[PDB]
From a paper:
Here, we report that the outer membrane lipoprotein QseG functions as an accessory protein that directly binds to and activates the histidine kinase QseE via its C-terminal domain. QseEF, a TCS responsive to multiple ligands including phosphate, sulfate, adrenaline, and AI-3, is essential for the virulence of pathogenic Enterobacteriaceae. Notably, genomic analyses reveal that a third gene qseG is co-transcribed with qseE and qseF, encoding an outer membrane lipoprotein anchored to the inner leaflet via N-terminal lipid modification. Collectively, our findings establish QseG as an endogenous activator of the QseEF signaling pathway via a conserved regulatory mechanism.
To elucidate the molecular basis of QseE activation by QseG, we sought to determine the 3D structure of the QseG-QseE complex. Purified QseG37-221-QseE complex was successfully obtained and subjected to cryo-EM analysis, yielding a 3.9 Å resolution map. Due to the inherent flexibility of HK structural domains in the cytoplasm, the transmembrane and cytoplasmic domains of QseE—including HAMP domain (a domain found in histidine kinase, adenylate cyclase, methyl-accepting protein, and phosphatase), DHp domain (dimerization and histidine phosphotransfer), and CA domain (catalytic and ATP-binding)—were not resolved. The final model was limited to the periplasmic region, including QseG58-220 and QseE34-173. Notably, two-dimensional and three-dimensional classifications revealed at least two distinct conformations of the QseG-QseE complex: one in which QseG aligns upright with the QseE dimerization interface and another in which QseG adopts a tilted conformation while interacting with QseE. The complex structure reveals a C2-symmetric QseG-QseE heteromeric tetramer comprising one QseG homodimer unit and one QseE homodimer unit. The C-terminal region of QseG forms a scissor-like structure that straddles the saddle-shaped dimeric sensor domains of QseE, consistent with our pull-down assay findings. Detailed structural analysis revealed that the interaction between QseG and QseE is mediated by both hydrophobic and polar interactions. Specifically, Leu209 of QseG forms hydrophobic contacts with Val77 and Leu78 of QseE. Additionally, Glu213 and Arg214 of QseG establish hydrogen bonds/salt bridges with Arg70, Gln74, Asp80, and Thr82 of QseE. Furthermore, Arg219 of QseG forms hydrogen bonds/salt bridges with Glu69 and Glu140 of QseE, whereas Lys220 of QseG interacts with Glu67 via hydrogen bonds/salt bridges.
Residue numbers in the entry:
A (entry chain D), C (entry chain C): 26 to 181
B (entry chain A), D (entry chain B): 58 to 220
Write the structure that this text describes.
């Protein structure tokens, strides 16, 4: 019957497109989150080193790193369902735009917000990993539903 | 044939003048041995009534004010002045004049030596103070740099152990 | 006939299992490669800092990082199709055990070796990401071809 | 009344020996004149053979070897020797003894002051050398530390540029 051929075509198209886009998006999201955490750690290190060792070149390097992190954060908003957490990360990053500390170490509130920034970035990478696993499991469940439909059609 | 006046008091011998007595040195020794035992303020009081226009009066003024504790500007002035005294002097008093001149010479030499010693001491103290303060500044700079190094290493260790 | 439908159902279930395991393995491979490159960078930093400062604590930190990288390398042998470059990384990492250097800087042979090690680690991450595309595209192509073959060859 | 012998003839003042001129000071003014006006080497040569225990002989020995750059130790020794023998000084001869002792003792004081000044200068130079070398050591420590800091910053820059 024509129904079998039509459903085969739809299955091919849907499964192929979903498999390709899910693989690519998951890989991009994982790599982006890992680079996010790494540049956050580098951000903290550059901040501390500039505060201990006063030098405008360290400030320029920190500016470049902050711009890179802001760009990379702007390309990850559409994946995490809760926009509040992404906006909080953006606000913390923009709060870390200035380098100010009186003593050798950073400002006390600066230290607290840096620790909050690190914890939030760790939670961000965890949430991105969970969403990636969710997308993979969703592909698995959809293809399982297709298999169940095939089994129901097997009754004839 | 020269008489002796040493046993009698030195006041009248110091008071008397004259060319007849001035040919003998023994009364000059009497005056010099009396001047030191005299009261320096009393010596100044008795020498104030003297003048400097003649060699004898300037000579005895030098004796009277030399033993007194005086600042060496006027001592230098009088030892530069007594060349006028040397310009007119009989041979009898030349030896004692020479001995007095040597005495004053080593006096002012000792004063100049002690002033040079004080100047060198103060110069050494000043340079020591300057070097000590420079050392303190450089030690503080080293403390600052070693604190910066220690803090930087500590932040590196903390970030390493965060992972 | 019903035998064809049963075979299609079983093949689809096996394909679902394959898709799930491929997704999970690919994600873990990408994460492992990124952590590999980050640990290599931290290795370089720790080596240079210990050489400059001559602190046994930095040496112990470097030893811990080297052990972590050795584990990570041991947990990645079976994915890369070729073995020469992986064995080269293993040998380079093992030889980068002692910390021998002069006048605040690694010796010239050690410096060139470290550079080459960094380039080879970059080649590792590139090759494993190429294998990632290979596995994803293999799953995509094989599911598409199986679907099309079953649809076209069962039109009667 | 004392006989006058104003001309200075040192060739026979040893031969007179002072047995009859002990009351006339001009004898010892002649002695000091002929001592300081003559070449001291002949004075030392003649004083070598003179008596030492006799008070007048020791006195004249002291005058005749008082010059020719003699070392301060034996100088203080000999003036203390005359002070030990200062019990035999005649009253008429006392003032010249007093002035001679004052001159000699002040010469010793000047020499001691010179020695003290030299000693203070040499301790000052030693302390300056010690402080300079300590400053050099601390300066090389500081430049080593700042080199380490510069190297650390440079490796940070290099690794940042690596990415």
């Amino acid at each position: 019957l024509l129904v079998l051929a039509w459903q085969a075509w739809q299955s091919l198209n849907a499964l192929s497109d979903q498999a390709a886009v899910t693989n690519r998006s998951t890989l991009i999201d994982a790599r982006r989150s890992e680079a996010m955490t790494n540049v956050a750690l580098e951000m903290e290190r550059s901040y501390r080193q500039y505060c201990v060792l006063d030098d405008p070149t360290l400030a320029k390097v920190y500016q470049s790193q902050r711009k890179r992190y802001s760009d990379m954060l702007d390309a990850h908003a559409g994946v995490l369902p809760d926009d509040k957490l992404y906006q909080a990360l953006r606000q913390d990053l923009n709060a870390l735009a200035q380098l100010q500390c009186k003593d050798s170490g950073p400002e006390a509130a600066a230290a607290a917000r840096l620790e909050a920034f690190a914890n939030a970035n760790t939670e961000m990478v965890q949430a991105t990993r969970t969403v990636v696993y969710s997308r993979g499991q969703q592909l698995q469940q959809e293809i399982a539903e297709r298999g169940q439909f095939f089994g129901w059609q097997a009754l004839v | 044939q020269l008489a002796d006046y040493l046993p009698t008091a030195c006041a009248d011998i110091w008071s008397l003048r004259g060319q007849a007595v001035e040919t003998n040195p023994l009364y000059w020794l009497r005056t010099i041995d009396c001047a030191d035992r005299l009261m320096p303020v009393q010596s100044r009081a008795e020498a104030r009534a003297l003048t400097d226009d003649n060699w004898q009066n300037a000579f005895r003024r030098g004796i009277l004010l030399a033993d007194a504790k005086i600042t060496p500007p006027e001592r230098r002035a009088i030892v530069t002045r007594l060349e006028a005294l040397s310009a007119q002097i009989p041979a009898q008093v030349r030896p004692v004049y020479q001995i007095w001149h040597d005495g004053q010479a080593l006096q002012l030499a000792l004063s100049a030596e002690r002033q040079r010693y004080s100047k060198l001491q103060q110069m050494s103290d000043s340079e020591l103070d300057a070097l000590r303060q420079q050392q303190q500044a450089l030690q503080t700079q080293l403390d600052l740099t070693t604190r910066k190094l220690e803090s930087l290493t500590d932040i590196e260790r903390q970030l390493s152990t965060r992972k």
